Chains A and B, each alone.
Chain A
């Protein structure tokens, strides 16, 4: 029935369960060593200690241990490009502090976590924090009133509550009241809140936050620099372990090619899994240089020349005429009329006759759906605008060679 199900879901009294498999999952003994290297190279498996992220670990651990042992509250801002060990280091610090608070080495605390990119509006942050405090789902105004009753009023013995805020830039709106309320509660004396906000841009407090919000946010920042060529090899060689499945030059080429594009760790840990999946189909047990080069070609893909090679004849004539019209009239944004005139000239040259514009609009729509050109709606025929989305040298490389 709807009524008791909603009243038991909103109160947090039934377990949100998920269905179970009929067949029991496979064994570790039934997995080969290449399969073991494929499961140990997953992005989901975080290690118990992160290689090449030690200085930031000691920085956040010293900050959070000071803020917990002082019982005062505060704010931190860490930032960096995606894939550089931010959330993993922060939850490793928090797991270390929880294990230290289990052994009576540290005063105990609560750990709340929210993510801005799983909230529908920022005010639902108030619904989620309270859901990690009691367990009951309420509206956002009642949850905000109860959080303001909890934090601003003194009530010993109050325990410290560390609030982690992932993806801060989604909680920023036109009014900026949610981020102001989150960064304002540590500034009170009765609330022992230690908030650590994680973001991608280094200049988030100056670009879009107001003056009082970047004044409350503080100046104890932290920056996670991207991975270099040497650390991104150490990550993969610590993931694989002592197995001889990956050669040294394979991991070196993977780290050198990934660390020159972005510095992401997820890119290397997915390229190595794709190389393992390639070497599984070659009936081998080792990952040589060839499988790594094939996986590098497949993952970092560039298929806007094969798409021009695999078009029809009239679409290649159409692309040649758009390139020739761009060459003739200088400016890149062309009209369909001059494109069709150069189509007629090129088709008179090659000998093959061209369809009327009632089919040339279909060719232009087919190139626009494939995103080889950028074109408008076809309701204004013979006057629609055409941008060339592929480079003018890609057409000459795809048709001459």
Chain B
């Protein structure tokens, strides 16, 4: 694969073959144990989802050793959680310090004392949501350097080695394996990292004065094709919809919090078109 520069400047049998691919990838596991014994780490860079392959390697091979599975595709994990887990849940030595490099020095000092206690860790999506900074990769490269800690990891993004320098690439003693499955990304995309009906549903929950205020805003929006606060205030005080200014301001605050009115300093624009708003207006006749 050699990319060209010009494009930048001018701008069933499938299941049986997938199970055959998975069995041919499951034939690699004692070779992976012999590679992991000699100081290397394992990196997978295929196309499909490699969650089931690492789960099968954990189940069928490492069913007795210490294992720290790290879901790197989780959108709200931290380095403090992983380091506190290694400090307090494996070593039973209290919470790790708040500065993470001192925690890595602590983990190195407590792992130097205990040989033949091999800790495995299986990072699904080493380039995940909260692992894309350089500090997390520096901490992971300091953790993978220890002769007891062994590392398996997955890679999914295309710009992943842009944040590994030669120090982080000589610390990570990687062995690049091509485990290209064809399974879809069903676990990595279900998290938080990846209208009219809501308007009708919220509008069916408001009271009658909120209905009158929102219909006044809708009528002004469909007449002038954003309204200031004083015109809405006079149009609501003429029809006895509000008592004072703070009642209308609380109604508009509830409108901003339920995402039906957009206020910009104080003009009030409903972020929809005229056709859906016209059919919404004739829906209440």
Direct contact of A and B (CB under 8 A): yes
Q: Which residues of A contact B (CB under 8 A)?
A: 203, 206-207
Is B246 positioned at the interface, with any CB of A under 8 Å from its CB?
A: yes
* Chain B interface SS verdict (over half): helix
* Chain A interface SS verdict (over half): helix
Instruction: Compute how far the CA of A203 lies from the CA of B245 in the bound complex, rounded to whole angstroms.
Output: 11
Chain B residue nearest to A206 (CB atoms) is B246
Q: Which residues of B contact A (CB under 8 A)?
A: 246-247, 250
Q: Which residues of B contact A206 (CB under 8 A)?
A: 246-247, 250
Instruction: Compute how far the CA of A207 lies from the CA of B250 in the bound complex, rounded to whole angstroms.
Output: 9
Q: Which residues of A contact B247 (CB under 8 A)?
A: 206
Chain B residue nearest to A203 (CB atoms) is B246
Instruction: Compute how far the CA of A203 lies from the CA of B247 in the bound complex, rounded to whole angstroms.
Output: 11
A–B pairs, 5, beta carbons within 8 Å: A203-B246, A206-B246, A206-B247, A206-B250, A207-B246
Q: Which residues of A contact B250 (CB under 8 A)?
A: 206
Chain A residue nearest to B247 (CB atoms) is A206
Chain A residue nearest to B249 (CB atoms) is A206
Q: Which residues of B contact A207 (CB under 8 A)?
A: 246
Instruction: List the 5 closest pairs (A to B, CB-CB), nearest first.
Output: A206-B246, A203-B246, A206-B250, A207-B246, A206-B247
Q: Which residues of B contact A203 (CB under 8 A)?
A: 246
Instruction: Compute how far the CA of A191 lies from the CA of B246 in the bound complex, rounded to whole angstroms.
Output: 33
Closest CB of chain A to B205's CB: distance in Å?
14
Closest CB of chain B to A357's CB: distance in Å?
41
Instruction: Compute how far the CA of A357 lies from the CA of B250 in the bound complex, rounded to whole angstroms.
Output: 54
Closest CB of chain B to A366's CB: distance in Å?
40
Closest CB of chain A to B105's CB: distance in Å?
37
Q: Which residues of A contact B246 (CB under 8 A)?
A: 203, 206-207
Chain B residue nearest to A214 (CB atoms) is B250
Instruction: Compute how far the CA of A207 lies from the CA of B246 in the bound complex, rounded to whole angstroms.
Output: 8
Chain A residue nearest to B254 (CB atoms) is A211
Instruction: Compute how far the CA of A206 lies from the CA of B242 in the bound complex, rounded to whole angstroms.
Output: 14
Instruction: Compute how far the CA of A352 lies from the CA of B247 in the bound complex, rounded to whole angstroms.
Output: 63
Chain A residue nearest to B250 (CB atoms) is A206
Instruction: Compute how far the CA of A203 lies from the CA of B244 in the bound complex, rounded to whole angstroms.
Output: 11
Closest CB of chain B to A340's CB: distance in Å?
38
Instruction: Compute how far the CA of A206 lies from the CA of B250 in the bound complex, rounded to whole angstroms.
Output: 8
Closest CB of chain A to B243's CB: distance in Å?
10
Closest CB of chain B to A268's CB: distance in Å?
32
